[PDB]
Request: fold
Amino acid sequence: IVGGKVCPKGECPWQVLLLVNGAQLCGGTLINTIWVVSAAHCFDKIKNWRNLIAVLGEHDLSEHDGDEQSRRVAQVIIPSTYVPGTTNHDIALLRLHQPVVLTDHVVPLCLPERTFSERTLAFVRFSLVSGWGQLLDRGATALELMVLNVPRLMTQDCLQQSRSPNITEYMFCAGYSDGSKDSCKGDSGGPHATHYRGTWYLTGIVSWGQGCATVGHFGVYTRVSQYIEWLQKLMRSEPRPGVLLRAPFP
Amino acid sequence: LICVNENGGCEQYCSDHTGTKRSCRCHEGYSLLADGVSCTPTVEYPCGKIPILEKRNA
Ligand SMILES: O=C(NCc1cccc(-n2ncc(-c3cc4cnccc4[nH]3)c2O)c1)[C@@H](O)Cc1ccccc1
Ligand SMILES: [Ca+2]
Ligand SMILES: [Cl-]
Reply:
């Protein structure tokens, strides 16, 4: 996160940190006690699936304060429509090996109904993006969880205002074009969370961009609304052997 | 009332029904109040709420 602030401890309780061999990989979003939403692209270069760890209740990476909860990732589910090394359909559903325990510091973000998301949430200007990603383009990553308020753009507008992947219907733009504020590498898979009438909802997944906080460019986010039904169906399904699962989309 | 306008007055989820009918709903871990629009937590840790902040104002 570029140009944000520290998310006060416990104020981002749905934020997940994904580790591979103890190394920072990506972010994620807790949507219930055993399910995490992330970005497909995060898992391209994964060698040994069995070394993937999800951490909940994380804040300051430099210390252990006992609010942290680590879980093995049992399943990584990616839509059939996702092509490795590209940006479209940038979503993953992760099944934890064991549920996390909900606490003051560990809470799921609401996965909204599609209709609600499309008709209402989509029109809420500002939303929060978070992660332990790069603080600057070509810079060091964050030790403390960072958060940033970003405004959402209609795609027509994003294209108009931008100055190379299309922005597809499975995406949306959010942020600023003045090079001051953005999500960055290391943040991907994390939440784009939207407030409505006292409750927060998952509307986006930190995905990609033309570099980080590049003048004349916006941050691009996976349009979660397109995937609600897909996600819901999967969450009702029995686990399958083997970590990686490609599931048809729609 | 219609869902597309003002969220049908619903706090959370909205369903249009046959006629001049509307039904509001709530996410798991919430229940719908008698006003037919409002949602109240039924659990300790409902989704999309920040405990330390809920407490901060409690
Ligand atoms: O290398 C791949 N996967 C492996 C992989 C693992 C973990 C992280 C990364 N990774 N590298 C760059 C960014 C990134 C830049 C950025 C700027 N603004 C906002 C969000 C942003 N994120 C990023 O998340 C890639 C391919 O899938 C290619 C691909 C596809 C999509 C994004 C990035 C790389
Ligand atoms: Ca810590
Ligand atoms: Cl575990």
Q: What stands out?
A: The domain at 1-58 of chain B is CATH 2.10.25.10 (Laminin). The helical segments of chain B are 51-56. Residues A 58-60, 63-65, 68 surround calcium ion (ligand 2) (CB under 6 Å). The beta strands of chain B are 13-17, 21-25, 30-32, 39-41.
